[PDB]
């Protein structure tokens, strides 16, 4: 172990703190330290490419430039054809997947998971499971997960254990298994231990999950409460879309006009899951209007 703090603060969503937990490691350049520094930096008001020298940190620079477009050019180019670290890969797969190349994205992931713990592996693993689920391969997601778990049963969970539960969580969310039970306690706790959007929003889904609109509603008025919609301006704007999404899916369970005034924000703002689908679906219908006139 070591910087289990920095990690446990990242996967929970308070980059605010996650950063101050890395500040503690007064300039001891470690790839892991860089990864997370870079990543928390991106997750916050602003990122600062720290060194374009590292055949890793030079990648991060790319990755971010990537995020401001859709060209995986220099990124994939200045990387492919030479064996590299999972941390490096991680960024690529993500890039790829953000583009929609999920089949390849996942491939990229597995390729890295294959350097068996060569630092960063567990981080990739999660990503693979996520990318997998994004593409709907729950079967694979599990298999990938299962086969890595019962595998390294050498109590290697020195801290990655929480990175691991995260993955499991996302899987459990898709499977819908123990939604009410164990999977609820998971988020439940997390929220109570680290109040953030990342965690609160998680809880929120779990509630919508359980048809408990009552509790869900509360979680929302709370997220609107001064403390979250104002007091944490940063990692609150980061999650606005998704939040809105849920606002809808809940507004719908109770059948409220809001469907518009609400996803109007998400629409004239982002283009993720909910809207990606909302588009496809809206077309499918107008498509049937043509078919029956």
């Amino acid at each position: 172990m070591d910087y289990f703090n920095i990690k446990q603060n990242y996967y929970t969503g308070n980059f605010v703190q996650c950063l101050q937990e890395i500040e503690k490691f007064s300039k001891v350049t470690d790839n892991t330290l860089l990864f997370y520094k870079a990543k928390t930096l991106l997750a916050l008001g602003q990122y600062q490419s720290q060194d374009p020298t590292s055949k890793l940190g030079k990648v991060l620079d790319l990755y971010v430039q990537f995020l401001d477009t859709k060209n995986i050019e220099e990124l994939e180019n200045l990387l492919k054809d030479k064996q590299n670290s999972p941390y490096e890969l991680y960024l690529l797969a993500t890039a790829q997947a953000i583009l929609g190349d999920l089949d390849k994205s996942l491939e990229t992931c597995v390729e890295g998971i294959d350097n068996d713990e060569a630092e960063g592996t567990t981080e990739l693993l999660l990503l693979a499971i996520e990318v997998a689920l994004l593409n709907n391969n729950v079967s694979t997601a599990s298999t990938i997960f299962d086969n890595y778990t019962n595998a390294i049963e050498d109590t290697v969970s020195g801290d990655n254990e929480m990175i691991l539960n995260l993955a499991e969580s996302y899987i459990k969310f898709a499977t819908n298994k123990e939604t009410a039970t164990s999977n609820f306690y998971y988020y439940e706790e997390l929220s109570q231990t680290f109040p953030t959007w990342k965690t609160q929003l998680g809880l929120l889904n779990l509630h919508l999950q359980q048809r408990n609109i009552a509790e869900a509603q509360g979680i929302v008025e709370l997220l609107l409460s001064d403390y979250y919609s104002v007091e944490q301006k940063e990692n609150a704007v980061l999650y606005k879309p998704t939040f809105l999404a849920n606002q809808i899916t809940l507004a719908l369970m109770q059948g409220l006009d809001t469907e518009d005034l609400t996803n109007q924000l998400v629409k004239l703002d982002h283009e993720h899951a909910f809207i990606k689908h909302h588009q496809e679906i809206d077309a499918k219908f107008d498509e049937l209007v043509r078919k029956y006139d």
Partner: protein
């Protein structure tokens, strides 16, 4: 992995829409309720579809969110009987009420718009107890009876001077709309007066009377009384109308001429509205969704 368990578990409209099978769903509704105009049914597929899917965010936030399905049941259930979540009467009722809200508020147009939303929601409803399927229908019935009632008064309003004959006709038909009595009052009162500003106490005494026999005492009620008196003093036939209180007939929902048991009529598979044979194979005027006359296997909603 998921969506399938739904379709496998239930092949009904709701579930089809929910599982993403819109063609499959449109088909089912033609066969069972003879739905034909798909347009005012768009947002309902949308709402059904979106209403059971929610998104969790995925670690590196700037990565597409993750889908999650909202099942209509908790852990303990036939690992078969797995189905999507869907609105329910809970709301149908809610909406119906807004209809009543607007009815009282004299905003006809809006009232109608409500009832239709109710009708549409029923159409794509999904129920647990055979029992509620029963209520879904009672609600459904009522609705058309209000869209009808209003549809008439609304058109009785869109009449130009001189059509006098027709106007009293409609005003008295409106009375026929099987609404909760309390709401039928407003109808009766409308009829009651217009058959007085037109010397027709042979029915005015009827309406005003059929009114007083539900409303005991109030500002309005008191007028209805005074009207039955000055009217029970001159059996006047100033203007002959097709309407005769003492008989059994239904009001055609397109014409607004009555349909006696002798009359050749045509119903609508969803609504139940009845029309003159004249208008067979046309769109029903209640919920502009299905084809009048076409045959339906019957509206499915019980799981």
């Amino acid at each position: 992995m998921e969506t399938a368990i739904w379709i496998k578990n239930s092949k009904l409209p709701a579930v089809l829409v929910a599982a993403g099978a819109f063609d499959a769903a449109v088909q089912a509704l033609s066969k069972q309720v003879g739905v034909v105009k798909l347009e005012p049914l768009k947002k309902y597929f949308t709402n059904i579809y979106e209403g059971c899917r929610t998104y969790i965010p995925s670690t590196p936030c700037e990565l597409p969110a993750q889908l999650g399905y909202v099942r209509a049941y908790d852990d303990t259930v036939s690992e078969d009987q797995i189905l999507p979540y869907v609105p329910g009467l809970d709301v149908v009722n809610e909406k119906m009420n807004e209809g009543y809200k607007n009815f009282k508020l004299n905003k006809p147009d809006i009232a109608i718009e409500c009832f239709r939303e109710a009708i549409y929601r029923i159409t794509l409803l999904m129920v647990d107890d055979a029992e509620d399927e029963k209520l879904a229908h009672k609600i459904l019935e009522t609705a058309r009876e209000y869209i009808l009632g209003l549809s008439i008064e609304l058109e009785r309003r869109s009449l130009k001077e001189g059509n006098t004959v027709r106007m009293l006709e409609l005003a008295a038909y409106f009375t026929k709309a099987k609404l909760s009595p309390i709401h039928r009052t407003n109808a009766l009162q409308v009829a009651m007066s217009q058959h007085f500003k037109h010397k027709n106490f042979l029915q005015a005494s009827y309406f005003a009377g059929e009114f007083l026999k539900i409303i005991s005492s109030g500002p309005r009620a008191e007028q209805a009384r005074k009207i039955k008196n000055k009217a029970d003093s001159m059996a006047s036939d100033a203007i002959p109308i097709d309407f005769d209180p003492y008989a059994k007939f239904d009001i055609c929902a397109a014409t607004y001429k009555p349909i006696y048991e002798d009359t050749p009529s045509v119903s609508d598979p969803l609504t139940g509205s009845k029309y003159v044979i004249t208008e067979k194979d046309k769109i029903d005027r209640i919920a502009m969704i299905s084809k009048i006359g076409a045959p339906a296997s019957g509206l499915r909603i019980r799981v």
